[PDB]
């Protein structure tokens, strides 16, 4: 006899107690499907620098190893939830392929980390790290068995798990010449070659080409998670992904030829993904409002090293590095006057989603908690990008010389056209294109982090 | 504007981008749905486990670390895919609660291993093991950092990586007086501590109790999957596992009081879950028929560490564990006359399940390639336990004195009724009631290795 149980994946249907051959070829689909999704959700950090490797090997064609300099708007627009006042040096490469390999830093004033290829944090550079901003050298080790004894002195060594890793600056120097001119030029990755050094490859400019890292869609997405198998040995805490992946035609050592089954299974787990990827971003239930009764949150939910006491920060990482990139204690500041603090919004003081078509208005209170300076970016929810507009700004700071209310707070209105009398205080949206921003806090004080002093939301005007 | 793109999880709404408030929480329910189904599969192994432990502890209430002796087929009948022939001595119990725990064998015939939680070998015992059938005294450490330094001679100090563990002894002892009067009486645990010495905790015998130690159903699944991350330290290998459970109510540390929401979607995870793993383990896409055109395969496609090259077996762990316990190198012998050799099918030459309302013939070739004998065990497949018939008997062994044909074969028949002419050469079946079978090989010689000698499938008859 055959019987039948309902089920939220379809009917379950077994005979004479065995499920039916149809219904076992339904549980392993629904098996590999849940899997693929779960493995998107997964693999969000890494994707990121995955694809950002690609642009610098292919598109950009720099050598492996070197460095690039991120400096004006378009150059930097591929970036995700870029910074719009600083300048950036960055360079990803796989030291499987480059070898012990050295970053020379000058003594100058920036502010950066080096990751791996899921972007823990594997040690601070310049100003935050060893160096102290008065420069040094820097020896990235691959992880395999044969330099496991490597540790030369003259050199910060650093020990990835991975072969992927990636560096980034960012310039504080002021002086822009300077940066242009003594910063930037005196930076250069080097091969260690047994301890006698290879040449030394410069930081180059970045082209004129319409780039970007995000993660990629379809079928694209999955071709990646497999090259980012391939480059990286496999590390403990992602056998079981790995296990799961293998019926998907994903595994370490072979080629990614997906059969047409295996692609439609993909290609649906990329668009269920995404939209998950989407929920798990913007609910951060993990985190709790900032401020009672507001939309505000803490933007980086995850650690450095994406370790919680009992399991590893699968949500959180796969949140904030859905919409940004990297991730240091200095971007994460408890310190008074140090480093920077992330709040983000997307929705307006009713719950809506922020959509360009419409005004909004953001009362900034006087004596904002930052030591230096804060500042609103606007970004696409989309691609969260730096929004593109025809102001040719996403930001607002308060550096600029904007409108400040008699008593000392100041109203940022965004909008797909300017608000009368407050022209220089707006950001320009977009029609029908939802967006959302960081609201920087650059040094924060001990009235942001006890939070004595408060913001409301983001209203509709 | 609302954008919708259906999906097989259902239609996803988009505005200005964002997915919808639903959407958003449809995703979230269906991510928390998704990682529920595949931590069921995940638990499999671990959970067999530990409903062990917990009948030997609150239904036997035998102290914390002492064994039983599971002699009488009523004993063993909660014993999953049980053995017919050899009486079984075997204990479980927590490291955290025994404190270091010594083990001592006697000189005598017996074979097993020592597993941990998730049923990975920690060490063989007896005849394969250390001592090798000679006596020796076992030294259980738990994995605790209080016990790192812990080596004392004249023991073989044992490291899990857990603290719940299994010992598990088959008896070959062929004199039964033998068996119940020497060997059993010669077993004992003992508390270590400090090197003190407790009292030995004698074995003691199964009362006459209606057990079994199958992972439950429903939310009794989820009770238990809690429990044992209670009770056990938290390995690397399953921290995403921790991190997807955290808000299905389940964390380290913390009790399990599930939601009216949360319970919803474990229930219905249970459900899909188990469909989940018949449909693995019956499929067995990681094994090959072991002879062309049949239905038979080896039935242990576990390896002893949960290690593959380049991921864990989750999947061949959970077809192994969700149908038997235990497992060590002797259950897959490779050497001409040692140990045993499992082959497994559940259905006929046809394709079919086997059913009990049929009549089945299988046709045992002569010569067939066990050193010492061969068996044929039914269980039934909701269950997986010995067959329970009018008969009495679940299994045929070569040690019984069957019919043989004139060329030597032999042949096994399997239905409700006898088959007139081979009443000692049958099984018994239920009607309706579905089943499998293990042909067991005692003392597989190379015959059976290189597969020179084969054997069909079983036949409707």
């Given at each position: ?87 950036y040096?960055?360079?990803?490469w ?5 070898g ?62 991975t072969?992927?890793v ?48 995000i ?5 694209e ?11 990286n040995?496999?590390?403990e ?33 990329s668009?269920?993904?995404?939209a ?91 004596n ?77 004080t001990?009235?942001?982090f ?12």
């Amino acid at each position: 006899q055959e019987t039948v149980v309902p089920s939220r994946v379809g009917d379950l249907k077994f005979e004479s107690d065995f499920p039916t051959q149809e219904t076992m070829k339904n549980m392993l689909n629904e098996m590999d499907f849940q899997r693929a999704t779960q493995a998107y959700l997964w693999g969000i950090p890494a994707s990121s620098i995955m694809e950002w490797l690609n642009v610098s090997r292919n598109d950009f064609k720099f050598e492996e190893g070197q460095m690039g300099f991120f400096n004006t708007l378009k150059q930097k627009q591929g970036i995700i939830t870029a910074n719009f006042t600083t300048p950036y040096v960055i360079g990803t490469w796989n030291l499987e392929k480059t070898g012990p390999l050295i970053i020379n830093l000058p003594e100058a004033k920036m502010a950066g980390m080096m990751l791996d290829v899921h972007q823990r944090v594997l040690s601070d550079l310049s100003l935050l790290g060893p160096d102290k901003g008065k420069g040094g050298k820097y020896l990235i080790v691959p992880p395999g068995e044969k330099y496991k004894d490597l540790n030369p002195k003259g050199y910060y060594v650093i020990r990835p798990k991975t072969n992927v890793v990636y560096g980034g600056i960012r310039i504080l120097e002021p002086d822009v010449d300077r940066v242009v001119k003594q910063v930037v030029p005196n930076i250069t990755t080097q091969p260690y070659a047994d301890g006698k050094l290879g040449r030394k490859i410069p930081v180059a400019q970045v082209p004129e080409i319409d780039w970007t890292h995000i993660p990629k869609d379809g079928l694209e997405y999955w071709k990646t998670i497999h090259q980012i198998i391939q480059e990286n040995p496999v590390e403990e805490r992602d056998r079981f992904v790995m296990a799961q992946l293998k019926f998907l035609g994903i595994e370490k050592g072979k080629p990614f030829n997906p059969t047409e089954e295996q692609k439609k299974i993909l290609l649906e787990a990329s668009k269920v993904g995404r939209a998950m990827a989407q929920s798990n971003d913007y609910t951060k239930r993990f985190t709790q409002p900032y401020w009672k009764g507001t939309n505000w949150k803490d933007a980086i939910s995850v650690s450095l090293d994406q370790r919680s006491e009992n399991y590893d920060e699968l949500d959180e990482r796969a949140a904030w590095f859905y919409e940004a990139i990297t991730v240091s204690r200095g971007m994460k500041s408890t310190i008074p006057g140090f480093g920077q603090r992330y709040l983000v919004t997307y929705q307006d003081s009713d719950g809506n989603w922020l959509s360009g078509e419409h005004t909004y208005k953001l009362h900034v209170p006087a004596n904002v908690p930052a030591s230096n300076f804060w500042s609103t970016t606007v970004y696409d929810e989309n691609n969260r990008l730096m929004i593109i507009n025809d102001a040719g700004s996403p930001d607002i700071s308060s550096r600029k010389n904007l409108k400040v209310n008699s008593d000392g707070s100041i109203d940022v209105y965004y909008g797909p056209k300017p608000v009368k009398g407050y022209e220089n205080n707006w950001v320009q949206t977009n029609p029908g294109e939802g967006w959302f921003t960081y609201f920087r806090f650059y040094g924060p004080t001990e009235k942001m982090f006890d939070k004595s002093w408060t913001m409301g939301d983001i209203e509709l005007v």
